[PDB]
């Protein structure tokens, strides 16, 4: 086939399976039960990614959605990728600040919602519709920042200095970074159709990359994560 945007993909898959092995041989040499949670949790990310990205290489996830008066590629891999590795960050910034049960489920279950609210879009035959389910997937993300800016950052505080200092730039970079996926959709594929395919999967695997390997690297090798 060679798409355009394979040499996207085929760089997303690298840098997701080396930051996996990184991840996963530096785990498995710590002692420290708590870290060993982390460690397994932040590997387990970019371990989903690479695979998701190896099959989008190859071929797979990928359907042709009918709107617009054209048929639409759109890379659904991409949210089977998602629905488990944003919870596994969210749970990564939970454990940090010792976030109680109730505001975990209720962030994972925020997450399920902008996941599959964002698919259903993403897979929408009636073009402004697509927007109606846009529009529900963003205001769930809105939510779960708020969550992580303002309960988060208000528990970290009773951590560590150094704990609370990791979270606050875990958490920089999440909102920075989150914030970024719902633009892509709009002017992208799933959307407007301005951003082209190719460009589109560059922005994504600049994110996800940004938001699961820089994430790890910033976590894993701080001291917070131990007991
Ligand atoms: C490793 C992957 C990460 C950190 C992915 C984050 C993805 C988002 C914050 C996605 C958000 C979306 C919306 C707000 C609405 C439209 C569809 C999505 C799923 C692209």
Redesign the pocket.
């Known amino acids: 086939t060679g798409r355009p945007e394979w040499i996207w993909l085929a760089l997303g898959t690298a840098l997701m399976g080396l930051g996996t092995l990184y991840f996963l041989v530096k785990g498995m040499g710590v002692s420290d039960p708590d870290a060993k949670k982390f460690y397994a949790i932040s590997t387990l990310?970019p371990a989903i990614?690479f695979t998701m990205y190896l099959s989008m290489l190859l071929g797979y996830g990928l359907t042709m959605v009918p709107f617009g008066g054209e048929q639409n590629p759109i890379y659904w891999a991409?949210?089977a990728?998602?629905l488990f590795?944003?919870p596994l960050?969210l749970l990564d910034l939970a454990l940090l600040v010792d976030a109680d049960q109730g505001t975990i489920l209720a962030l994972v279950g925020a997450d399920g919602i902008?996941?599959g609210?964002?698919?259903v879009?993403?897979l929408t035959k009636v073009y402004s519709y697509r927007f109606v389910?846009?529009?529900i997937?963003?205001?769930?993300?809105?939510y779960?920042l708020y969550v992580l800016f303002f309960g988060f950052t208000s528990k970290a505080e009773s951590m560590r200095p150094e704990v609370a200092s990791t979270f606050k730039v875990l958490r920089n970079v999440?909102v920075v970074?989150?914030?970024?996926?719902?633009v892509?959709?709009?002017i992208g594929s799933?959307g407007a159709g301005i951003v082209p395919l190719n460009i589109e999967t560059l922005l994504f695997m600049v994110?996800?990359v940004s938001?699961?390997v820089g994430?790890g690297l910033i976590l894993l090798r701080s001291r917070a994560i131990f007991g």
Not at 137 to 142: P, R, V
Not at 177 to 182: D, G, K, M, V
């Open positions: 990310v990614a991409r949210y990728d998602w590795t944003t960050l902008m996941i609210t964002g698919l879009g993403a389910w846009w529009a997937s963003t205001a769930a993300m809105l779960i999440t970074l989150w914030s970024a996926y719902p892509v959709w709009l799933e994110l996800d938001a699961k994430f």
